[PDB]
Design a protein around this ligand. Structure first.
Ligand SMILES: O=CCCCC[C@@H]1SC[C@@H]2NC(=O)N[C@@H]21
Lengths: 86, 181, 66, 270, 79, 91
């Protein structure tokens, strides 16, 4: 790229509990877990920045991380697939 | 073994004295199926069918132990070809196929002139393509007094539902009126 | 006595039967499971129905009752 | 003592449903977001209010809508204190928009305001074609609108000749070259121009009412799949793969999947 | 990296609502009565017909068919 | 009347005890011909492949007067076949 902010992410399937969606616009400030790896309920797995505001998207249940569609400093828009978990 | 029919599909506008029309083929679905050989000529998506050649689009052939079954296959292979951006003899051939006189197999060369109801053709239907166009136009140039933007995200709407039957058991003010004016 | 015909199956064989049936002027219905959102046979019948957002992907064509 | 007869548990459910659906229409939401008590001064119908916001907007009076309401009140007294609802509201509607467009006031007619070209509706009103107000109009303030014709006095329908439905059938059957219903017939009479355009669009695009609303207004996203229920167990499944750059003919290619079949459609970029 | 028009003074006719011309009714050199339909124009749910102020001869027409207009734009001039 | 041959094209990788390779089909060329019958199943353009059905992409069948002629119909229509992005039992 020169800058992977160009990349298009698929949309989270909304009626599917494995897909975490972007609840709002913003930026990936820190990638935190990798593809295929164990996490507990309420674990930080991705720090976003909204409008000079932190918020740390956390895991809904105990999981094996299926996919991660993001790197540090990627653009994100409402309804974007950020993570999958089993 | 059994019987085989062949039809040739042509660019020929059967309503315009059978004149070989030309242009770009912007879509093309063949059928397939047992007892059906497709022999593709000019017929396929992308072709520039040309004022200067024989207008055969497809040669269609079918085969079954009975004439009637061979006819049933021809009718259906025809019914299932869609070609757009040019008028065709397909509606006609179908009509040839359903004709009592063709099937009985007692027919002569005068058959076509002696049967006016083979040009009993209706201008074709296309709901599916027409929709792709609308979406095509709105995606690119957008809708009248709506802010031309990405299709905004929407919350997943969960739509409550009641069965027709329960509905039909109900007796409301409508039944009231039918009853007593 | 058959006006309308359902195929309890998928893939090549559903297609074949749909064509037989169509050739006898018999109306057709296909079933699909969830994994089969996009098997072609879903699109080759006159009508089609999702079998079960309850049932397993293997299981969805073995549910006698549904 | 008296209660409301209905199902609440169920109206909450209806409510959650329209809460979301309304989302689809936010392009058409009015500027009111508060109860306004100056309504007792305007007297503008609730079901004109947002239809006229739209209208004002389109003639470049968006933002200037508050002055469009001032005039709506002023127009009312100009006319002798009338009832305002469809279509008398529309006439007030138009005379307010019209006067504001043209930095006009009540004195721009009373010995001053002449050759002005009043809207359709408003000359209609003084010609009498909407009716006769309780208290009438003010001759001197009308004269200058219609001069040429005069007021017709009787309710219109008792001199308006009957419409010929015969001739209307021959007309629609001629242009549509097909079978044509009684609905078509009054729909056409009620709305000659608009009905025609509905037909234009229908020939061109089929029955749009089956599209979901978001798709209807916005189309589709690259990689999006859309289901259109066409009947019981009949649907179109449509996938938009990508769109290409406009070829030198200003035409883009759209790569589609429809019902398990690859399809390409060409659209002109305006 | 469209001439407006003169309110106060001369018998021009200005645009009195912004929209589209649906039909021009009278040609560039022509006689015309007072109050005669001249030009037909369309806004959203609106339609002003334009008419003869005087009773005279038309010098010019500054719109065709299907033309967009703004408020205070010249469309006819009559003496 | 003459002879007919059938075989099945499976996602089974012969170079792996026949293990039904799974994933997406990103290229598909069905041939056909005279005396050829193509009964398509899992084999088409976009949509991908489930582990949870018996691997059947195309059932391929051929017909001619002698066995020889049928077999050489069959090889041709295998050779003309190009599926991609999953492995196949074709060679
Ligand atoms: O064409 C746009 C919708 C109609 C605008 C006028 C409506 S009709 C009912 C209500 N009463 C009015 O006088 N205006 C609105």
């Amino acid at each position: 790229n020169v800058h992977t902010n160009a990349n298009v992410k698929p949309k989270a399937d909304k009626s599917n509990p494995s897909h975490i969606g972007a609840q709002m616009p913003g930026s990936v400030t820190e990638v935190k877990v990798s593809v295929g790896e164990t996490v507990k309920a309420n674990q930080p797995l991705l720090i976003t920045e909204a409008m000079k505001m932190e918020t740390t998207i956390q895991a809904p249940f105990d999981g094996v991380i299926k996919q991660v569609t993001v790197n540090n400093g990627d653009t994100i828009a409402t309804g974007d697939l950020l993570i999958e978990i089993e | 073994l059994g019987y085989a029919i062949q039809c040739r599909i042509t660019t020929e506008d059967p309503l315009n004295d059978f004149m070989p029309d030309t242009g770009t083929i912007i879509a093309y679905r063949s059928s397939g199926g047992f007892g059906v050989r497709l022999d593709a000529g000019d017929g396929f998506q992308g072709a520039e069918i040309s004022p200067y050649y024989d207008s055969l689009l497809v040669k269609l052939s079918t085969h079954a132990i009975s004439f009637k079954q061979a006819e049933e296959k021809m009718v259906r292979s025809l019914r299932e070809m869609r070609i757009r951006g040019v008028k065709t003899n397909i509606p006609f051939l179908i009509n040839v196929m359903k004709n009592k006189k063709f099937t009985s197999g007692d027919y002569t060369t005068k058959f076509i002139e002696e049967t006016p109801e083979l040009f009993d053709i209706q201008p074709s239907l296309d709901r599916g393509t027409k929709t792709l166009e609308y979406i095509g136009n709105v995606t690119i140039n957008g809708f009248p007094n709506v802010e031309k933007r990405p299709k905004p995200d929407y919350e997943l709407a969960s739509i409550p539902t009641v069965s027709s039957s329960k509905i039909a058991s109900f007796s409301g003010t409508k039944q009231l009126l039918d009853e007593v004016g | 006595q058959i006006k309308k015909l359902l195929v309890a199956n998928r893939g090549e064989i559903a297609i074949r039967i749909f064509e037989a049936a169509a050739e006898l002027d018999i109306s057709t219905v296909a079933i699909y499971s969830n994994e089969d959102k996009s098997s072609l046979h879903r699109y080759k019948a006159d009508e089609s129905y999702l079998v079960g957002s309850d049932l397993g992907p293997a299981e969805s064509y073995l549910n006698i009752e549904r | 003592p008296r209660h409301l007869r209905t199902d609440i548990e169920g109206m909450e459910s209806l409510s959650h449903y329209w809460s979301t659906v309304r989302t689809y229409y936010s392009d058409f939401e009015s500027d009111i977001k508060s109860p306004n008590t100056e309504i007792y001064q305007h007297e503008m119908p609730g079901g004109q209010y947002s239809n006229l916001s739209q209208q004002a907007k389109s003639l470049g009076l968006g933002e200037r809508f508050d002055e469009v309401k001032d005039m709506y009140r002023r127009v009312n007294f100009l006319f002798g204190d009338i009832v305002k609802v469809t279509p008398s509201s529309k006439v007030v509607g138009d005379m307010a928009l019209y006067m504001v467009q043209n930095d006009l006031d009540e004195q721009s007619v009373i010995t001053d305001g002449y050759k002005l070209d009043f809207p359709e509706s408003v000359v209609s009103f003084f010609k009498g074609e909407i009716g006769q107000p309780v208290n009438g109009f003010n001759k001197d303030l009308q004269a200058v609108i219609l001069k040429g014709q005069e007021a017709l006095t009787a309710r219109p329908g008792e001199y308006l000749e009957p419409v010929d439905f015969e001739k209307v059938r021959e007309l629609l059957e001629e242009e549509q070259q097909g079978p044509v219903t009684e609905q078509d017939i009054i729909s056409y009479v009620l709305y000659p121009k608009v009905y025609e355009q509905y037909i234009q669009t229908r020939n061109q695009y089929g029955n749009l009412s089956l599209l979901d609303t978001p798709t209807f207004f916005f189309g589709m996203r690259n990689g999006e799949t859309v289901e259109i229920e066409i009947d019981k167990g009949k649907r179109l499944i449509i996938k938009l793969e990508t769109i290409s750059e406009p070829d030198e003919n200003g035409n883009r290619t759209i790569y589609y999947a429809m019902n398990g079949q690859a399809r390409r459609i060409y659209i002109k970029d305006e």
